[PDB]
C-alpha cells in the first residue's frame, strides 16, 4: 500500500531537501559518539513516500487541529531517525511505539537538526551501530532517515524535564527550546501519529574528515 518515488537529483525538491539536511548539521556534546563523526552527508537517494490512507488520516487530524487552533495548522518539515523506518513508511507514525525514555514523556520526537535525528537511526543513543560492521560511526553502510511533515498546532514550550502521556490542555504538541546547561538543540514532540507524515525517505551516508 506504499509506493516510493525516487526524486531525480536535478529536481528542485531533491536539492531543497538535501540543502535542508546538510545545513542543519551541528556538533553535539557527546563528541559524535552515537551518530558518529561527520560534517556533511553523502546523499544516495531521496524518495517520496506515497500512501493515500496515511495522507487521509494526516489531513483529517490536520483539519481537526486547524479547527482547534485559529484555523492555522502549524505544519513544519522536521527530521526523524529510527531503526524502524520501513514500518513507519508502510504503516505510518504510531504513538503506541513512542519514545518512553524521552524527556517530554512517551511521545513521538522530531529534531530540527539532521544530526540529532541521525543519533537515533541505529537506535536509542546510537544503539549498537550498523548491522554489518557493528560501528555506529560507519562511513560504509547506507543509513536512512525521514524528512517528515509534522502538525504542531498550538505548541507548548517546556524547557525543563516534564514527562507527560499526552499534549497539554488546549495544545497539540510540546516544543523544547534550547537552554543553557539544559538541552542543546530544539525538540518537537507530538503524541498522535496522525500529526506526522513521512514525506521524504532519505538514503544517505556519513563522510570521514
Ligand atoms: C530525545 O529523543 C529524540 C530527540 C530528537 C529526535 C529524535 C528522533 O528523531 N528519534 C527518536 C527516536 C524515535 C524512536 C525510537 C525507537 C528511538 C528514538 C528520538 C529523538
Ligand atoms: Zn558498517
Q: By C-alpha distance, which of 78, 200, 198, 206 is closest to 130?
A: 206
User: In 10 A of CB 11, how many CB atoms?
Assistant: 11
Give counts: helices (H), strands (E), the chain: 4, 9
Dist CA 127 CA 120 (whole Å): 8
Ligand 1 in contact with 95 (CB < 6 A)?
Answer: no
List, in order of start, the domains of the chain with CATH numbers.
1-209 (3.90.228.10)
Secondary structure in 3-state letters for 37-60 = CCCCECCCEEEEEECHHHHHHHHH
Q: Which residues contact 36 (CB under 8 A, 6 or more apart)?
A: 118, 126, 136, 137, 138, 139, 206
Give whole-number Cα distances, 38 to 122, 123, 144, 204, in Å: 16, 18, 15, 12
φ and ψ of 115, to 5 deg? -65, -40
Q: What 8-state DSSP symbol labels residue 123?
A: S
Q: By C-alpha distance, which of 4, 192, 27 is closest to 93?
A: 192
* Angle at alpha carbon of residue 112, lines to 103 and 160, rounded to 5°: 25
User: In 10 A of CB 18, how many CB atoms?
Assistant: 18
Indicate if the alpha-carbon torsion angle 87, 90, 91, 95 is positive or negative: positive
**Partners of 4 in beta bridges:** 49
Grid cell at residue 62? 490536520
CA of 10 to the centre of ligand 1 (A): 31
User: In 10 A of CB 105, how many CB atoms?
Assistant: 19
Locate the ligand 1 atom nearest the alpha carbon of residue 185 and give its number: 5
Q: Are strands 108-111 and 173-176 parallel, antiparallel or unpaired?
A: unpaired
Given a contact cutoff of 8 angstroms between Cβ atoms, the answer to whether 94 and 190 are in contact is no
Dist CA 152 CA 65 (whole Å): 8
φ and ψ of 52, to 5 deg? -65, -30
Q: Which residues contact 141 (CB under 8 A, 6 or more apart)?
A: 130, 131, 132, 133, 205
Ligand 1 in contact with 129 (CB < 6 A)?
Answer: no
Give start and end residues of each alpha helix (H) in 93-170.
114-118
Closest ligand by atom to 88 CA = 1
Strands (E), the chain: 3-6, 45-50, 75-80, 108-111, 143-151, 155-157, 173-176, 187-190, 196-204
Amino acid at each position: 500500500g506504499t509506493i516510493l518515488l525516487d526524486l531525480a537529483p536535478e529536481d528542485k525538491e531533491y536539492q531543497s531537501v538535501e540543502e535542508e539536511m546538510q545545513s542543519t548539521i551541528r556538533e553535539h556534546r557527546d563528541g559524535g559518539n552515537a551518530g558518529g563523526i561527520f560534517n556533511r552527508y553523502n546523499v544516495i537517494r531521496i524518495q517520496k513516500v506515497v500512501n493515500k490512507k496515511l495522507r487521509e488520516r494526516f489531513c483529517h487530524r490536520q483539519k481537526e487541529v486547524s479547527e482547534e487552533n485559529h484555523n492555522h495548522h502549524n505544519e513544519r518539515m522536521l527530521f526523524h531517525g529510527s531503526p524502524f523506518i520501513n514500518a513507519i513508511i508502510h504503516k505510518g507514525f504510531d504513538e503506541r511505539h513512542a519514545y518512553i525514555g524521552g524527556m517530554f514523556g512517551a511521545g513521538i520526537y522530531f529534531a530540527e537538526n539532521s544530526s540529532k535525528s541521525n543519533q537515533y537511526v541505529y537506535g536509542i543513543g546510537g544503539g549498537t551501530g550498523c548491522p554489518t560492521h557493528k560501528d555506529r560511526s560507519c562511513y560504509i553502510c547506507h543509513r536512512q532517515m525521514l524528512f517528515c511533515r509534522v502538525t504542531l498546532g498550538k505548541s507548548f514550550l517546556q524547557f525543563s524535564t516534564i514527562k507527560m502521556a499526552h499534549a497539554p490542555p488546549g495544545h497539540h504538541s510540546v516544543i523544547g527550546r534550547p537552554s543553557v546547561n539544559g538541552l542543546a538543540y530544539a525538540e518537537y514532540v507530538i503524541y498522535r501519529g496522525e500529526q506526522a507524515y513521512p514525506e521524504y525517505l532519505i538514503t544517505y551516508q556519513i563522510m570521514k574528515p
